[PDB]
Amino acid sequence: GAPATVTEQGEDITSKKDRGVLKIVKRVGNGEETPMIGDKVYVHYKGKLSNGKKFDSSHDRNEPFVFSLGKGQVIKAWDIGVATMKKGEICHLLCKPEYAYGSAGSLPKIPSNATLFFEIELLDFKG
Ligand SMILES: COc1cc2c(c(OC)c1)[C@@H]1[C@H]3CCC[C@@H](C(=O)N1CC2)N3C(=O)C(=O)c1cc(OC)c(OC)c(OC)c1
Numbered sequence: 001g002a003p004a005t006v007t008e009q010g011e012d013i014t015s016k017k018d019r020g021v022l023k024i025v026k027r028v029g030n031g032e033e034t035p036m037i038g039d040k041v042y043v044h045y046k047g048k049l050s051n052g053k054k055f056d057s058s059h060d061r062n063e064p065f066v067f068s069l070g071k072g073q074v075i076k077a078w079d080i081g082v083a084t085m086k087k088g089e090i091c092h093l094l095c096k097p098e099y100a101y102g103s104a105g106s107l108p109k110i111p112s113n114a115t116l117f118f119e120i121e122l123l124d125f126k127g
Contacts (some may be wrong), residue, residue: 002092042066043120081093
C-alpha cells in the first residue's frame with residue numbers, strides 16, 4: 001500500500017540524511033515557490049499508524065489544519081515536509097519516530113516508537 005511504497009520508494013528530505021522523513025510527490029503543485037518560516041499554512045491531511053489505523057483526517061472534519069511553519073507547532077517531519085511543498089501539491093510523508101512523537105508517543109492515538117504515514121495537500125500559504 002501507500003505506506004509501504006513511500007517507505008521503499010521515497011526520497012530522504014532530511015538535512016541529516018538519516019532517512020527519518022521520506023517523501024513522494026503525488027501531485028505537482030504550482031510554480032516553484034514553497035512556504036517560508038512563519039507563514040500561515042493551510043493543509044488537508046490523513047494520518048495512519050504502522051498498524052494500519054487511520055488516526056486522523058482533516059477531510060473528515062470539513063476544515064483544513066492551519067499552523068505557522070517552522071515554529072515547532074507540529075512534529076518535526078511536518079515542519080520539514082511542508083516546507084518542501086508547492087501550493088496545490090499533494091505528497092506522502094513517512095515519518096520515523098525521531099521526527100514525530102518519539103518514545104513518548106501521544107495518548108490516546110499514537111504509540112511509543114511509532115512510524116507515521118501522512119498524505120498532505122498544501123492548500124495555501126500566506127505571510
Ligand atoms: C492533541 O491533539 C492534536 C495535537 C496535534 C495535532 C492535532 O491535529 C488535529 C491534534 C497536529 C496534527 C496535524 C499536524 C501533524 C501532527 C501534529 O504535529 N499536530 C500538532 C499536535 N498531527 C497529528 O499527528 C494528528 O493528526 C493528531 C490527531 C489527533 O487526534 C485526532 C491527536 O490526538 C487528539 C494527536 O495527538 C498528538 C495528533
